[PDB]
Amino acid sequence: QTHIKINRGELLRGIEQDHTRQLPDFRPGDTVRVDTKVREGNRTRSQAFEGVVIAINGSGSRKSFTVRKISFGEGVERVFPFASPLVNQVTIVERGKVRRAKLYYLRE
Amino acid sequence: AKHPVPKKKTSKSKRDMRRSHHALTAPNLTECPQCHGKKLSHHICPNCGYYDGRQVLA
Amino acid sequence: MKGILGTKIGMTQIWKNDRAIPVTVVLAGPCPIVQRKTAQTDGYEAVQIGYAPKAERKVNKPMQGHFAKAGVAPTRILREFRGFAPDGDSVNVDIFAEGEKIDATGTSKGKGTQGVMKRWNFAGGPASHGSKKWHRRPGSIGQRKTPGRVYKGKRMAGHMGMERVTVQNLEVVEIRAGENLILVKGAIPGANGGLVVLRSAAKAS
Amino acid sequence: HGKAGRKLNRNSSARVALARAQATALLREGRIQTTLTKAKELRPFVEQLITTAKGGDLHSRRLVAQDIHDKDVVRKVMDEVAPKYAERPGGYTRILRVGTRRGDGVTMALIEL
Amino acid sequence: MIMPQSRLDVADNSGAREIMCIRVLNSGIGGKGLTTGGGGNKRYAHVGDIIVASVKDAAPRGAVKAGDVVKAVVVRTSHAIKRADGSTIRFDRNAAVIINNQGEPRGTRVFGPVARELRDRRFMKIVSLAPEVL
RNA sequence: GAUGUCGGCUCGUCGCAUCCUGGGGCUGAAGAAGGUCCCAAGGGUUGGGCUGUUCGCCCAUUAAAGCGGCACGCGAGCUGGGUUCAGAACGUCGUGAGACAGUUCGGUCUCUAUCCGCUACGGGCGCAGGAGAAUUGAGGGGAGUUGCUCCUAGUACGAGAGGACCGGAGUGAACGGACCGCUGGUCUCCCUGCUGUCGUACCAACGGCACAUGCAGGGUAGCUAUGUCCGGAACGGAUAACCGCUGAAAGCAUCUAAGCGGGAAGCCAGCCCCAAGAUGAGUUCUCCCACUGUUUAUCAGGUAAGACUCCCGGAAGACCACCGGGUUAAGAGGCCAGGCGUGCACGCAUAGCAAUGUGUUCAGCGGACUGGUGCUCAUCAGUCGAGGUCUUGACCA
RNA sequence: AUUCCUUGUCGGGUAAGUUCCGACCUGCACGAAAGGCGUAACGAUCUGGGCGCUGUCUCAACGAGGGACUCGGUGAAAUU
RNA sequence: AAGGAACUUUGCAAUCUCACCCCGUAACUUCGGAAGAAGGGGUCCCCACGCUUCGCGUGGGGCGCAGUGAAUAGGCCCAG
Ligand SMILES: [Mg+2]
Ligand SMILES: [Mg+2]
Ligand SMILES: [Mg+2]
Ligand SMILES: [Mg+2]
Ligand SMILES: [Mg+2]
Ligand SMILES: [Mg+2]
Ligand SMILES: [Mg+2]
Ligand SMILES: [Mg+2]
Ligand SMILES: [Mg+2]
Ligand SMILES: [Mg+2]
């Protein structure tokens, strides 16, 4: 509509790297996201969801990863924004051998 | 049977009232730079078969 | 009043403190002032601002002149703003300010000809227990011999979209002057690359 | 809306059959005449194909073997016509439109190498 | 989300194994006991929302019983709750906690993790029997 | 020589004798909760179970869960359960053929809109020169719901129990607009995996067909909700009921006959959208300019500014239309780079009797995404398009 | 499938049941070859219920193909 | 997606099941059946070993989300 000469592509980068964070590698295989649960009253907790990564959707500010796990009898899937301020640090636990970017089938 | 159907015959006039839009615009023929017959803008001159050089065969 | 022109560039993620926030990046590109209008000259008070630049080899002899009357430089887009002023040119710097609520208006994406389910919501019907009216199709247009006709406005399939939309009180998250970039909370209407007009809130609490 | 990016008029298996089919012709005769549109759809597909052929190794060959089910033709594209376009940034194949037709009134066209 | 006819699992020794939804109240825990409805609509129960329910299965021996009509608080939706950091959670099955007009678990303890959401919801005691609060 | 019938579904819209919200008077109105009458139709008025039902009874909620009208609104809109065809059955009546206050199971509901009306979209002409672009707003539409909690205040009030007005804060529901960053959904050939068969001589590698994707797994752009973001406002003007100041006719009393003021979710304005065919056809800025044609072809003909035609495209679209480019070029394609998706290629090597594993290989492949680049095509060229009526008035030297 | 008053009454099941099941009986107008009552197996039979799955539904959404649209060829109809 | 008959006259329609081995299988019954009741498991490739051969059994190995791996291909039950 406005036909200015412009790389819409980058303008975005430049307003996205100021909110983008790298993390260990991993691809699947166990992980342990030690995240801080700052929400209890004023008190700032510290939880540690851990287990099988099942997807690495997106990139840039939006990049994230999904981790499946079975807490106390009932399966749980958490989804993390690589730059979610709610995350202190991620760590591989044990590289896995699979053959497809997803794993969904693992929900069973 | 034929559910909708028209209530009266339409005025020879009314017939026309609409047809006031079926007049074909005619080609804007142009003249070749090379055999000079008239060509159709942006296509190969049917007659000599050109488009700067001779594309189609004579 | 206060206001500017810009292009919608896209949406993305941004955190503020610990609250993830969808934002829409507008390029309120700088804006030349090509024509001031006073009630004493044009019947009212307003301002003519400009936008996407345009190659002079593409500028009408007439437009050239208009533009010359205020040595500016063919823009290609002009728009007026009311009760506005400023000298020089209009840029968001010192115009909008992080925190302000604004009314980003632009032109809705264009959905062509749409039925009623998708344009007025309707509800169509039965998709199994008998039909030919499956899902969409509006039901009945009215009543009988009385108001033996339909009402001026019944909702039916029309060209949906391609409209002027305004959205109100959207937080102005970050302003990156000198990049005439501006991230706005929430979403603005109109497809990426389209014109968008950000203004002070027309009506804010 | 419908803000996608492609073209059909037949199904999924068909558009394929066509592209491949005309793809072959053009490559086998450097210039075929066809419906203006059937051309435009073809243009890129054949071009992409040449850029593949344009690598030499068995691989690039066998990729081309997937859209050229005529050995003779593939060999041509592979060793005769691909090698030649070596120096140009891919992008060779031009369309030339012709007269309108009688039978259907459809404006025919030229797609040449 | 949860809605009428939507069977949940009970995350408590309340005695009722499985309950079918009957209505989604607009979960009013506050003030004195549980505040009253916030609208007569609201169609989906989301973790931390209170529903009304009809016990479709209770175990032999237990406060609650089959055919009882109770109030429960949704603690595990297989939907997806989305926190302010921007993370996302979703449990394999939907489960609730039968409760009383004070919003206290009719049971002597909760079972399975529970939505941290319940915490902002001020449903403190529940949280308190929660083996976890992911 | 035919005005289709009950109910429902859909789509509505109107009256008020208002169900809920809003303003009030009186109360046997302590407060809180009510009753009642008056003003008031802006908006709103849940989901289930039983029944063909309308009704109604009940479950669970709600501010509320209003009553009616529109051919008991709406079948050239749908259903077709109910009932006014043919089959069959029971009870009952009839000697019968048959019948019915009845009950029961079964039983074809007709692609093609002329006119008006309606929603969208163009063409023409007009709007006293010919054009490019920016607007005023006459008028018209959309919207117009409500809870809960907190503060004030555990105050006023009340023996107490219980427990506010007013004002001020938050946070939901449903609805609607926009949107696709997110979370998801799809993505009909973008990647991979798998079977059977036929083929490319064979092996190996591939293709077809097994839907109109053979099936499976996944998935960019796009489009999309159960996903996001925002909104229903404030203030204002005039009012309803109602309440009041000054105040005679009735040296008193009186909201009244002079006069004046306060006062509702309602009226008008304000908010978003449309809008000069507002033929009363408006305003502003800019551009092109005053040509040619002997009472034989009386008017059209070159042309300016400008635009169309055509080509290549589009977050625009049924068509038209709208936007962008069209070599003084980055418009689209291709091509290069990157991105993202698939998840490790062909080949060779090595391990293994083999199936396979491993290595070269974070390979290989590649729709729709970001840039770059003159490789392809946007060639050439045609068509159209002003010289501005008259009257009065005002100004110029 | 013979009941009008009638959604009879109680029980069953459901959160809630004008229907269904079981009893009762006051059988409007059951009943013994116009057969009475019962019965395993058989039913594109009719009724009520449950498990399972599901776009039937909350609500729709994306995708495909054939029409619908547009150009060239041919070119009806009922109605009036 | 989530939910799962809330649809609605009626789950109408459309899913699910869906082949062949094996384990297993109720009330009731004229003992025949009800029964494919219900339910559960297996199913491809390679190698060795034996079998009656096509084929199959035992054991070990292998690959994928998945092996009647694509087409043909019962949804089941309770009561009336
Ligand atoms: Mg995803
Ligand atoms: Mg629907
Ligand atoms: Mg009141
Ligand atoms: Mg009608
Ligand atoms: Mg997506
Ligand atoms: Mg698929
Ligand atoms: Mg006032
Ligand atoms: Mg087009
Ligand atoms: Mg142009
Ligand atoms: Mg019986």
XYZ file of N, CA, C and O (backbone and C1' of nucleotides) and ligand atoms in Angstrom, chain F residues 237-239 261-264, ligand 7:
50
model
P -24.310 21.394 30.275
O -25.288 21.415 29.026
C -25.133 22.400 28.024
C -26.122 22.162 26.936
C -27.551 22.024 27.422
O -28.157 23.287 27.619
C -27.059 20.269 25.948
P -29.229 23.454 28.790
O -30.524 22.699 28.250
C -31.123 23.088 27.019
C -32.153 22.075 26.568
C -33.188 21.652 27.585
O -34.196 22.628 27.753
C -32.425 19.755 26.445
P -35.261 22.447 28.931
O -35.776 20.944 28.722
C -36.407 20.172 29.759
C -36.760 18.798 29.216
C -37.545 17.861 30.113
O -38.936 18.133 30.129
C -35.735 16.668 29.187
P -32.969 28.691 34.113
O -32.733 27.694 35.331
C -31.713 27.976 36.272
C -31.668 26.929 37.355
C -31.484 25.474 36.964
O -30.128 25.154 36.732
C -33.054 25.652 38.710
P -29.760 23.724 36.114
O -30.161 22.661 37.234
C -29.305 22.394 38.341
C -29.834 21.226 39.144
C -29.927 19.885 38.429
O -28.688 19.195 38.486
C -31.913 20.271 39.654
P -28.421 17.954 37.511
O -29.767 17.124 37.566
C -29.983 16.202 38.609
C -31.188 15.377 38.300
C -31.135 14.643 36.973
O -30.415 13.421 37.135
C -33.198 15.763 37.189
P -29.483 12.865 35.946
O -29.998 11.368 35.789
C -29.929 10.691 34.551
C -30.767 9.444 34.599
C -30.688 8.609 33.340
O -29.591 7.715 33.452
C -32.947 8.966 33.902
Mg -29.003 19.633 33.176
